[PDB]
DNA sequence: CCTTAAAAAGGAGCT
DNA sequence: GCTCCTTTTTAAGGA
Protein backbone atom coordinates (compact mmCIF):
# COMPACT_ATOMS: atom_id res chain seq x y z
CA UNK A 1 0.00 0.00 0.00
CA UNK A 2 2.95 2.29 -0.78
CA UNK A 3 2.66 5.88 -2.03
CA UNK A 4 5.09 7.80 -4.25
CA UNK A 5 5.14 11.61 -4.35
CA UNK A 6 6.98 13.65 -7.02
CA UNK A 7 7.68 17.38 -6.64
CA UNK A 8 9.74 20.08 -8.35
CA UNK A 9 10.70 22.05 -5.23
CA UNK A 10 12.53 24.84 -7.11
CA UNK A 11 15.47 25.43 -4.79
CA UNK A 12 16.26 24.31 -1.24
CA UNK A 13 19.21 26.52 -0.22
CA UNK A 14 17.34 28.28 2.62
CA UNK A 15 16.94 26.41 5.90
CA UNK A 16 13.49 27.93 6.41
CA UNK A 17 12.12 26.43 3.21
CA UNK A 18 13.87 23.19 4.19
CA UNK A 19 11.86 23.00 7.42
CA UNK A 20 8.70 23.91 5.49
CA UNK A 21 9.32 21.02 3.09
CA UNK A 22 10.02 18.82 6.12
CA UNK A 23 6.59 19.57 7.62
CA UNK A 24 4.89 19.17 4.24
CA UNK A 25 6.48 15.74 3.69
CA UNK A 26 5.50 14.60 7.20
CA UNK A 27 1.93 15.68 6.54
CA UNK A 28 1.86 13.94 3.14
CA UNK A 29 3.38 10.71 4.53
CA UNK A 30 4.75 9.23 1.28
CA UNK A 31 6.51 5.88 1.17
CA UNK A 32 8.87 7.43 -1.40
CA UNK A 33 9.28 11.10 -2.26
CA UNK A 34 11.09 12.32 -5.39
CA UNK A 35 12.42 15.89 -5.30
CA UNK A 36 13.73 17.67 -8.39
CA UNK A 37 15.70 20.91 -8.66
CA UNK A 38 16.94 21.02 -5.07
CA UNK A 39 19.65 23.40 -6.33
CA UNK A 40 21.83 21.66 -3.77
CA UNK A 41 25.48 21.31 -4.53
CA UNK A 42 27.30 18.22 -3.38
CA UNK A 43 29.17 20.23 -0.72
CA UNK A 44 25.71 20.91 0.74
CA UNK A 45 24.31 17.35 0.28
CA UNK A 46 24.30 16.77 4.05
CA UNK A 47 21.93 19.69 4.68
CA UNK A 48 18.87 17.81 3.34
CA UNK A 49 17.61 15.97 6.43
CA UNK A 50 13.93 15.35 7.20
CA UNK A 51 12.98 13.55 10.41
CA UNK A 52 11.19 10.32 9.57
CA UNK A 53 12.96 10.03 6.18
CA UNK A 54 16.48 8.90 7.08
CA UNK A 55 17.39 7.28 3.74
CA UNK A 56 17.98 10.03 1.16
CA UNK A 57 19.77 9.46 -2.16
CA UNK A 58 20.42 12.66 -4.11
CA UNK A 59 22.48 13.56 -7.17
CA UNK A 60 24.05 17.01 -7.18
CA UNK A 61 26.28 19.01 -9.49
CA UNK A 62 28.87 21.54 -8.35
CA UNK A 63 26.57 24.55 -8.98
CA UNK A 64 23.34 25.61 -7.28
CA UNK A 65 21.32 24.25 -10.20
CA UNK A 66 19.37 21.02 -10.82
CA UNK A 67 19.88 18.50 -7.97
CA UNK A 68 17.56 15.49 -7.59
CA UNK A 69 16.79 13.40 -4.52
CA UNK A 70 14.85 10.30 -3.47
CA UNK A 71 13.63 10.08 0.14
CA UNK A 72 12.42 6.80 1.66
CA UNK A 73 10.11 6.66 4.67
CA UNK A 74 11.40 5.04 7.85
CA UNK A 75 8.02 3.27 8.07
CA UNK A 76 8.73 1.39 4.83
CA UNK A 77 11.55 -0.99 3.94
CA UNK A 78 13.97 -0.28 1.11
CA UNK A 79 16.82 -2.59 0.03
CA UNK A 80 18.71 -0.95 -2.85
CA UNK A 81 20.79 -3.00 -5.29
CA UNK A 82 22.63 -0.43 -7.42
CA UNK A 83 22.42 3.37 -7.57
CA UNK A 84 23.50 5.51 -10.53
CA UNK A 85 24.04 9.22 -9.85
CA UNK A 86 24.32 11.67 -12.74
CA UNK A 87 27.62 13.55 -12.67
CA UNK A 88 25.77 16.83 -13.35
CA UNK A 89 22.87 16.22 -10.96
CA UNK A 90 20.03 15.78 -13.45
CA UNK A 91 18.91 12.22 -12.70
CA UNK A 92 19.40 9.52 -10.09
CA UNK A 93 18.43 5.86 -10.52
CA UNK A 94 17.83 3.76 -7.40
CA UNK A 95 17.36 0.02 -7.98
CA UNK A 96 16.27 -2.56 -5.44
CA UNK A 97 13.29 -3.68 -3.37
CA UNK A 98 10.36 -1.93 -1.67
CA UNK A 99 8.31 -4.16 0.63
CA UNK A 100 10.12 -7.17 -0.86
CA UNK A 101 8.80 -6.29 -4.34
CA UNK A 102 11.37 -5.24 -6.94
CA UNK A 103 11.48 -1.61 -8.02
CA UNK A 104 13.79 0.65 -10.04
CA UNK A 105 13.10 4.39 -9.74
CA UNK A 106 14.57 6.95 -12.14
CA UNK A 107 14.15 10.48 -10.74
CA UNK A 108 14.93 12.84 -13.62
CA UNK A 109 15.24 16.60 -14.18
CA UNK A 110 15.71 17.55 -17.85
CA UNK A 111 16.91 21.04 -18.83
CA UNK A 112 14.37 23.29 -20.49
CA UNK A 113 16.23 23.49 -23.80
CA UNK A 114 16.26 20.19 -25.68
CA UNK A 115 14.28 18.38 -23.00
CA UNK A 116 12.81 15.35 -24.87
CA UNK A 117 16.11 14.47 -26.54
CA UNK A 118 17.85 14.64 -23.15
CA UNK A 119 15.20 12.44 -21.55
CA UNK A 120 15.58 9.77 -24.24
CA UNK A 121 19.35 9.97 -24.31
CA UNK A 122 19.37 9.13 -20.60
CA UNK A 123 16.58 6.58 -21.11
CA UNK A 124 18.61 4.65 -23.67
CA UNK A 125 21.95 5.45 -22.03
CA UNK A 126 20.81 3.38 -19.05
CA UNK A 127 18.52 0.70 -20.51
CA UNK A 128 20.76 -2.21 -19.46
CA UNK A 129 19.79 -1.10 -15.93
CA UNK A 130 16.18 -0.45 -17.05
CA UNK A 131 13.71 -3.32 -16.79
CA UNK A 132 10.07 -4.43 -16.39
CA UNK A 133 9.65 -2.83 -12.94
CA UNK A 134 10.76 0.69 -13.88
CA UNK A 135 9.30 3.98 -12.59
CA UNK A 136 10.69 7.15 -14.23
CA UNK A 137 9.25 10.31 -12.73
CA UNK A 138 10.07 13.94 -12.19
CA UNK A 139 10.60 17.27 -13.92
CA UNK A 140 10.37 16.37 -17.60
CA UNK A 141 10.24 20.08 -18.59
CA UNK A 142 8.20 18.98 -21.62
CA UNK A 143 4.64 17.88 -22.43
CA UNK A 144 3.83 14.33 -23.49
CA UNK A 145 0.30 14.56 -24.87
CA UNK A 146 -1.43 17.57 -26.40
CA UNK A 147 -3.30 17.97 -23.10
CA UNK A 148 -0.09 18.76 -21.19
CA UNK A 149 -0.26 22.39 -22.41
CA UNK A 150 -3.12 24.80 -21.75
CA UNK A 151 -2.46 26.34 -25.17
CA UNK A 152 -3.29 22.85 -26.54
CA UNK A 153 -0.81 23.55 -29.34
CA UNK A 154 -0.28 20.00 -30.45
CA UNK A 155 2.90 18.38 -29.63
CA UNK A 156 6.50 18.84 -30.86
CA UNK A 157 8.27 16.22 -33.00
CA UNK A 158 10.93 15.42 -30.37
CA UNK A 159 8.19 14.86 -27.80
CA UNK A 160 6.25 12.29 -29.84
CA UNK A 161 9.55 10.61 -30.70
CA UNK A 162 10.02 10.40 -26.92
CA UNK A 163 6.50 9.08 -26.33
CA UNK A 164 7.44 6.36 -28.86
CA UNK A 165 10.88 5.63 -27.40
CA UNK A 166 8.86 4.99 -24.26
CA UNK A 167 6.99 2.58 -26.54
CA UNK A 168 10.04 0.72 -27.90
CA UNK A 169 10.89 -0.09 -24.26
CA UNK A 170 7.23 -0.57 -23.18
CA UNK A 171 7.22 2.44 -20.86
CA UNK A 172 4.01 4.43 -20.60
CA UNK A 173 2.79 7.68 -19.00
CA UNK A 174 1.02 6.31 -15.90
CA UNK A 175 -0.87 9.59 -15.40
CA UNK A 176 -1.89 10.21 -19.04
CA UNK A 177 -3.19 6.67 -19.31
CA UNK A 178 -4.96 6.37 -15.99
CA UNK A 179 -6.19 9.90 -16.79
CA UNK A 180 -6.65 10.88 -20.44
CA UNK A 181 -8.87 13.85 -21.23
CA UNK A 182 -7.15 15.63 -18.32
CA UNK A 183 -7.21 19.33 -17.59
CA UNK A 184 -4.99 19.22 -14.52
CA UNK A 185 -1.62 20.96 -14.74
CA UNK A 186 1.53 21.06 -12.63
CA UNK A 187 3.15 24.37 -13.66
CA UNK A 188 1.77 27.86 -14.28
CA UNK A 189 3.88 30.24 -16.38
CA UNK A 190 3.13 33.81 -15.22
CA UNK A 191 5.04 35.59 -18.04
CA UNK A 192 2.53 34.03 -20.45
CA UNK A 193 -0.45 33.24 -18.21
CA UNK A 194 -0.26 29.68 -19.50
CA UNK A 195 -0.48 26.28 -17.83
CA UNK A 196 1.41 23.08 -18.53
CA UNK A 197 1.98 19.58 -17.19
CA UNK A 198 5.76 19.32 -17.54
CA UNK A 199 6.12 17.05 -14.49
CA UNK A 200 5.28 13.40 -15.02
CA UNK A 201 5.08 9.81 -13.80
CA UNK A 202 6.07 7.20 -16.40
CA UNK A 203 6.33 3.54 -15.59
CA UNK A 204 6.57 0.07 -17.03
CA UNK A 205 3.38 -1.30 -18.46
CA UNK A 206 3.94 -4.44 -16.39
CA UNK A 207 3.04 -2.36 -13.27
CA UNK A 208 -0.24 -1.00 -14.78
CA UNK A 209 -1.80 -3.80 -12.83
CA UNK A 210 -0.55 -2.35 -9.56
CA UNK A 211 -1.23 1.36 -10.16
CA UNK A 212 -4.38 2.24 -8.24
CA UNK A 213 -4.71 6.02 -8.02
CA UNK A 214 -2.99 9.25 -9.05
CA UNK A 215 -3.40 12.78 -7.74
CA UNK A 216 -2.12 16.34 -8.10
CA UNK A 217 -1.37 18.50 -5.06
CA UNK A 218 -1.13 22.28 -4.87
CA UNK A 219 1.45 23.51 -2.38
CA UNK A 220 2.93 26.70 -0.93
CA UNK A 221 6.48 25.37 -1.39
CA UNK A 222 7.00 25.73 -5.13
CA UNK A 223 5.56 27.09 -8.35
CA UNK A 224 5.21 23.43 -9.37
CA UNK A 225 2.55 21.00 -8.17
CA UNK A 226 3.26 17.57 -6.72
CA UNK A 227 2.03 14.26 -8.17
CA UNK A 228 0.96 11.44 -5.83
CA UNK A 229 0.66 7.78 -6.86
CA UNK A 230 -1.00 5.06 -4.77
CA UNK A 231 0.40 1.59 -5.41
CA UNK A 232 -2.04 -0.64 -3.49
C1' DC B 1 17.47 33.68 -29.88
C1' DC B 2 14.96 37.22 -27.22
C1' DT B 3 11.89 38.72 -24.01
C1' DT B 4 9.00 38.28 -19.92
C1' DA B 5 7.44 37.50 -14.48
C1' DA B 6 8.49 36.13 -10.20
C1' DA B 7 11.02 33.45 -7.07
C1' DA B 8 15.80 31.88 -5.66
C1' DA B 9 20.34 33.23 -5.06
C1' DG B 10 23.70 36.74 -4.31
C1' DG B 11 25.91 40.89 -2.56
C1' DA B 12 26.78 45.54 0.21
C1' DG B 13 27.27 47.24 4.67
C1' DC B 14 26.78 46.81 9.23
C1' DT B 15 26.36 43.60 13.41
C1' DG C 1 25.96 35.55 9.33
C1' DC C 2 22.04 38.97 8.73
C1' DT C 3 18.43 42.95 6.29
C1' DC C 4 17.36 45.09 2.09
C1' DC C 5 18.05 45.50 -2.29
C1' DT C 6 20.13 43.69 -6.92
C1' DT C 7 21.10 39.99 -9.95
C1' DT C 8 20.59 35.56 -11.59
C1' DT C 9 17.66 31.61 -12.79
C1' DT C 10 13.92 29.23 -15.00
C1' DA C 11 9.96 27.77 -18.22
C1' DA C 12 7.68 29.50 -22.48
C1' DG C 13 5.69 31.88 -26.23
C1' DG C 14 6.93 35.41 -30.32
C1' DA C 15 9.98 36.69 -34.01
Three-class DSSP labels, chain A: CCEEEEEECCCCCCHHHHHHHHHHHHHHCCCEEEEECCCCCHHHHHHCCECCECEEEEECCCCCCCCEEEEECCCCCEEEEEEEECCCCCEEEEEEEECCEEEEEEEEECCCCCHHHHHHHHHHHCCCCCCCCEEEEEECCCCCCHHHECCCCCCCHHHHHHHHHHHHCCEECHHHHHCCCCCCCCEEECCCCEEECCEEEEEEHHHHHHCCEEEEECCCCCCECEEEEECC
Q: Phi, psi at residue A158, to the nearest 5°? A: -60, -35
Q: Is the CB of A191 under 7 A from strand B?
A: yes
Separation of first and last alpha carbons in chain A: 4
CA distances from A149 to A12, A71, A184 (A): 27, 29, 10
A37 is in an annotated binding site: yes
Residues in chain A: 232
**A27 Cβ neighbours under 8 A, 6+ residues apart:** none
Query: Could you say which residues 147-176 of protein chain A have a Cβ atom less than 7 A away from any atom in strand B?
Result: none
Q: What was the structure determination method?
A: X-ray
Q: How far is the CA of A207 from the C1' of C14 (A)?
A: 42
Question: Where do the structural domains in chain A lie, given as residue ranges?
Answer: 1-232
The answer to whether residues A123 and A136 touch, using CB atoms and an 8 Å cutoff, is: yes
**Distance (Å, rounded) from C-alpha A119 to C-alpha A192?**
25
**Distance (Å, rounded) from C-alpha A65 to C-alpha A88?**
9
The nucleotides of chain B lying under 7 Å from a protein CB are 3-10
Q: Is the CB of A80 under 7 A from strand B?
A: no
Beta strand A3-8 with A32-36 is parallel
Query: Which residue is closest, via its CA, to the C1' of B6?
Result: A190
Centre a 10 Å sphere on the Cβ of residue A52 and count the other Cβ atoms it contains.
12
The number of CA neighbours under 13 Å toward the Cβ of A33 is: 27
Q: How far is the CA of A197 from the C1' of B3 (A)?
A: 23
Beta strand A213-217 with A226-230 is antiparallel
**Nearest DNA or RNA nucleotide to A190 (CA to C1'):** B5
The nucleotides of chain C lying under 7 Å from a protein CB are 9-13
The answer to whether residues A67 and A58 touch, using CB atoms and an 8 Å cutoff, is: yes
Amino acid sequence: HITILTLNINGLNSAIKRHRLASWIKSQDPSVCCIQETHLTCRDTHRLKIKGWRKIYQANGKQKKAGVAILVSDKTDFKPTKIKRDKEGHYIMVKGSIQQEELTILNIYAPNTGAPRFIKQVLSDLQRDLDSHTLIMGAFNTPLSTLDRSTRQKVNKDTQELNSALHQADLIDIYRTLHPKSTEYTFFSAPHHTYSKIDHIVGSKALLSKCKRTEIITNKLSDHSAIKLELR
